[PDB]
Write a sequence for this structure.
RNA sequence: UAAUGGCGAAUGAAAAAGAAAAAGACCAAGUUGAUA
RNA sequence: UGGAAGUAUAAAUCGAAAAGGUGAUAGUAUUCAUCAAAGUCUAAAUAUUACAGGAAAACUGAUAGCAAAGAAGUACUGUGAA
RNA sequence: GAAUAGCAGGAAAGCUAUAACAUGAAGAGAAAACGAAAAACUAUGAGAGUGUAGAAAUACAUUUAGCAAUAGUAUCUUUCAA
RNA sequence: GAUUCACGCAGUGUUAACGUGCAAAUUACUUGUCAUAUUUGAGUAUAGGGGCGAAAGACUCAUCGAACUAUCUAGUAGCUGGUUCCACCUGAAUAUUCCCUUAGGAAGGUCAAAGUAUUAAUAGUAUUGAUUGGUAAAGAUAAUGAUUAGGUGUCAACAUCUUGUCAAACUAUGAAUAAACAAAGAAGAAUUCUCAGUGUUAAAUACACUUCAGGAAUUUAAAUAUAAACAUACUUUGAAUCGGCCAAGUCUGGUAAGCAGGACUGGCGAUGCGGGAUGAACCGAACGUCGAGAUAAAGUGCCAAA
RNA sequence: AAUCCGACUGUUUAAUAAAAACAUAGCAUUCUGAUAAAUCUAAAAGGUUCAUUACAGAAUGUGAUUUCUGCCCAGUGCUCUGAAUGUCAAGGUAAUGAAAUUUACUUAAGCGCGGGUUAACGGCGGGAGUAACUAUGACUCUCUUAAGGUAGCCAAAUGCCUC
RNA sequence: GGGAACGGGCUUGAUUGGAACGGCGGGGAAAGAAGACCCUGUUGAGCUUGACUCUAAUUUAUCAUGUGA
RNA sequence: GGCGGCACAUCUGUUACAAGAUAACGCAGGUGUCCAAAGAUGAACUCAAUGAGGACAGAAACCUCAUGUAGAAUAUAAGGGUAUAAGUUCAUUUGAUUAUUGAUUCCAGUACAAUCAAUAACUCUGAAAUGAUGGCCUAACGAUCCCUAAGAUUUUUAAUUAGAAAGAAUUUAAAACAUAUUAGAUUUAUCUGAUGUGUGAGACCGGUGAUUUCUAGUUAAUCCUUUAAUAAUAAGGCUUGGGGUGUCAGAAAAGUUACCACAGGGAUAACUGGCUUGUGGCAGCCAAGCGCUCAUAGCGACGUUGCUUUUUGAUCCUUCGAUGUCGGCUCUUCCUAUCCAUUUCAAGCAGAAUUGAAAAAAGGUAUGAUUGUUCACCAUUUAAUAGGGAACGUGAGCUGGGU
RNA sequence: AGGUAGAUUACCUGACGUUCCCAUCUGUGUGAACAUAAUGGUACUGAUCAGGCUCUAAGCAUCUUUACUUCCGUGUUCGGAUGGGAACGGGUGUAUCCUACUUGAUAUGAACCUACC
RNA sequence: GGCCCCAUAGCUCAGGAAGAGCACGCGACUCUUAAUCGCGUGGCGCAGGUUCAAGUCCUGCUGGGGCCACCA
RNA sequence: CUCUUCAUGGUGCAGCCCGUUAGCUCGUCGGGCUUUUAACCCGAAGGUCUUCGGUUCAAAUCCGGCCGAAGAAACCA
RNA sequence: UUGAAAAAAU
RNA sequence: GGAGUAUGGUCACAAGGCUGAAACUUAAAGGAAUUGACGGAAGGGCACACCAGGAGUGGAGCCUGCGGCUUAAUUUGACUC
RNA sequence: AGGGAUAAAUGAUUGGAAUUAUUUGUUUUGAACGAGGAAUUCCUUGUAAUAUCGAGUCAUUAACUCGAGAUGAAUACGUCC
């Protein structure tokens, strides 16, 4: 929902409680050279039409939120998953 | 078996190693031109 | 295709060489290893349910064994393939 | 009776072949890289004796034994993790 | 591309005949039509996701909402039918989990056959002891609600004392039946002496665990009833099955149902015999082949034994 | 003597439907200058209309004659002699890197915007106020989505209620 | 009567002489046909459509070097 | 079956039967969220309501005292829990974190998910004991493959210095050419021959020693792989989250067939039959009244008890390798809950015409317009023109009007 | 006798009144500093002038409540079992188990460690 | 049968702390009328249940309207 | 998912892609013109320019998530 | 450029 | 007036043409000229009618009259120049 | 310090009677109004405009009317819009 930045939490690398900078994780752009996409592009070549299933029955209206609690002095990130929330904001 | 596959159903070789039999020869290109 | 950033063939375009190919994870570089493509022929070891000639059989013994143990692909059916 | 090579006999049968390999003797890890003893411990448990007695059968007491099996232990190999 | 008759043709009606017919579409009368959008022979052209169609999915060799014929092909079927000698022994299921699952499958339960272990490894039972529950019941100014009135105190109202009747989604109290323990297995008890390693601790000689650490002596087979050695504990492999139905000193939906669905048990299914005349379930009682005897349910005027 | 359908002659489900069904002439619409339009074929100096040439060829709806064909271009089709950087591919160019790669700019048709089109597919409702008996509304504002059933016709082979 | 709730067979009764001819149409839940109405199959086929995935024909851009501005 | 609904994943009370399990398209409701505080901790206070008082101020504003077992509040549905709190107010803070075990709940004793008990860190609050790994508890959710993020500096090594200790190391036939010197040629990114040499060499004589340890520094690399060796890009590994399947153990999916086809089914509908009789028909009991007087000549309200299968329902037991599915015509038979004729009783029965009831089913109970109609409504005639059953009698008896 | 800490958590609670303080406890005085809030009312701290006035503790009452006992009553209900009775509905007999509400009698606390009177 | 809704002056319709028009009567205006204006009469279907207060929230009853239904 | 666009009184349309304090009509009230009515004219009220930030001397107006609609294109858990 | 209308008998 | 309408006949493809009533209703309908009034008809003059201007009023406070509202009554006449 | 509205104290005149203040004196109170929209009035020379004086009403009461003088514009000598 509303979670402020600058959270002070335990950092495994430094083995200490250091101030962390909190952000929100977003899925990165899909690479065109990974094994799964490389294999898929080969399958789609040639005749036969669509060769792999296409999902068309979405039911979830929300998604789980993953933060990036990042070390401010050692750059050690942590991924923490929150519950499903409809509206999420990063507070002050 | 390695691998391939809505990596699902399924498909799937080869070097090595052991035997049968064993055998290598030519064109073109290059050279020789009282040239055949 | 087992060959997975392409194992092989073909088509469109492109297209080498004071050579070069391969070492299957794409790329550049330096070494190493091993061959030298884009012409041709080549016996022996292997396959065989055409067909012909033979020999065998824990095979069948006339509703069985070939569809057919007699003028059997015959009698008979169909316009015809059958 | 892996192909395969010999023997007598003439044999789809029989016999002989220091033999590649298959399973197994060592296990864990994706992989690199590794690779097992405190010559074990505890508990209950199979068998064998001796004596006395009922007295025909056999039962009571004592000495010894530790197998199989189950369970738990220390130790050791591999794994982020047994 | 007028009206009619005739040779012919068609197929309006009888919904006549026939309907194992003359005929795998015919016959009789009746009706319509009977030359120019006419009738007809032969030749020739058009071929299967094709042809041809004044259009009915009509016709394409008795085959058409996609011909015939041969191969793939013994296509696939969770669906239907059938599945072949005798005797003997043991003998089921309709729970649970998952499935594009509901006419079907896999884990699991019931069951069979093989193979074991002297075996801390017996109980669909009763008694004694300490417990758990909130059902039947009961209560109704005892908590939450429902509801009939009568007094007393300051029309009504609000207090307070009585009265009548209630609750599956109310409760103080609370059975009967039940559920889970104990009634002596580190191997059948107890006591005395000795006693170690860790740790708790303020430190411990307390305490905790260590085969009631360990070790040695003495005593000892005791500690509810009943039953149980072809007992008990299993191990492995695997078949069939998960459409069920019935009864009730039971329940829920429904007016009710030989209706629909559940808790506990016993049955039919898988089951014959004696009785209820006949009946899957009711009553007695479960079955190798017989002889004799008392019996069961139930019967004793005749059918019919008494 | 009347009513319904079809205008007429004609054709049709060989073997349960011969008819109001099909055809028909009449009316109307669309495309095409022939190297075209339609359209068969895998391909082809290949093939059909076509030995043809707009009084023609090809593709459709309605069905003689008479009378009349109302209003709507919002949506979906079709079309345009229309506008441009709304969105749109491989490619092309350029930058970085050792190179693959990565990044950026540009590029056609198509759709979207704008106009036309209903004898193109189709649609033709609702609310409020109003005439001197009541009633209705000739008349005015008006929302969806563009217009709100016109001329006619009717318990119709079309009307539940309905005998 | 009970039974699978409409028996020719079973139980209890009514009743029966063996063989049959011509009719007729009550029954034999008469014959003809692995229901065609309905449902179930993770069985099909014709037809339709911006159902999903594709494809012929149509169309557009780039490539494929004729000479001179 | 369809349409409707989700009993498909799921929570609360009840059905439900005082252990556990537990049915219906049973009943009353609920979920796909919300929260940087509504998490954690410490402190203080006590809520709803009632009584008595105080200007506006009243039934409801704010203040004070007394009583006040929660009758308030606790994000939500319901049920549980809670008073020096779990409620309200204030203050600090992020434990809503990392790593490893062993259990409990559905359980097949699988996964997911949830519920716990500890250990090793680093922290929050408090003086402290303690408490803290999200929300007081029971719902608030998700596989293989794919994609996308986070993590593997702890340690182990190689080379070189200083010191220390153990150390023969296997044994005769040789080709690449890094180089040099010459021989024959070419001008070009210039080559082709032949002879020395080392390389590339290895057979040590109790001591030398090539070679591996240990200690102290320095330097470089340090999660694994791309299989001849490295490098920097790229890709693949290993662990943990996110992107989702709501048909919730998780295919990628529109209709119509009346032209339809196949395997099957009474596991399952349309017709009879069977159980039931709400509904339809008929019949009773009581007596408030009507009937000018008079409850019962004739009716009988409010209540209440039955019979019938002639209507329609409810169920799905028989029939799906077929029981010919409406009506009419013809014909026979049966029931009485009787319409007429026959014999009787009663009246608010003078006669006539009637009305209520008993015996009795041997006899009779019609003709037509409209409709396929059963039904209906008309016009007549008659002593009367009654009501029903027989597989809703009757299609190898007819018709084919309806469906 | 009193005070601190408790364990059982109403025989301990609630209402109307009553009895002492000799020690202790309490109420009581004050606000400079620690510290406290709008208020020295709370909490905090400093003290001892007075008081048993309330607390607290001990007792009273046909006291509500609460805890034991008989009775209610072998009454309601219940396990087993008929070819027992009834058209149903419901209700016996047999061998068994046996509540609750109510009313009546009794009680109104017992008990542990430390200090001081 | 089920479901949705409505019930208010003499008439047609509005409304948690009883109205609009039509109807009648009175008055203003005019020389007199017709129109027009102002004012007054003219009453929530019934019975409970919560609230300090209901036409206004809910339940039961009465009356009146429109709407759903395929193969056999 | 990518690109692009729009949102303003009760209503519909304006507005400056730099900016300095927002208008035109219908709708309401009142007044004016007319002998009177209808048309006609005028004034007032009516939004502060969707919601939060930055952008400065100030934002409907320049830029960002957020709202809530529209157009084109794409889709392996 | 726009300019519609004025109830009946007296 | 009804009415060139209904009906009858006839001509035309049709629109329509030719012939052609009655019922009923009503004291006027109409013709030419006169005078007046009016004209978003022409011609000629005039007026603070306008033009060129001044002061203004309309905006504000107050005085005053009218309407409306109110009230026991707010007495009433006059409503374009 | 323009403006003098609305109010609060107080002093007198007229009146038989002053309250809803008759008129007025002293002090204090210090409001709108920053030149005025559409419309619209009056005016051509001692005229408009500006400020004042007398009289009618009158016990007391002018911001009214009828007259009187005091300063002294601009713009026309025109046309029917």
């Amino acid at each position: 929902v509303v979670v402020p930045k600058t959270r002070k939490t335990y950092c495994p690398r430094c083995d200490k409680h250091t101030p962390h900078k909190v952000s929100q994780y977003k899925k990165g752009k899909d690479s065109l050279h990974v094994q799964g996409k490389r294999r898929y592009d080969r399958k789609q070549q040639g005749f036969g039409g669509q060769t792999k299933p296409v999902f068309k029955k979405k039911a979830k209206t929300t998604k789980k939120v993953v933060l990036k609690i990042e070390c401010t002095k050692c750059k050690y990130k942590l991924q923490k998953c929150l519950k499903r929330c409809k509206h999420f904001e990063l507070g002050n």
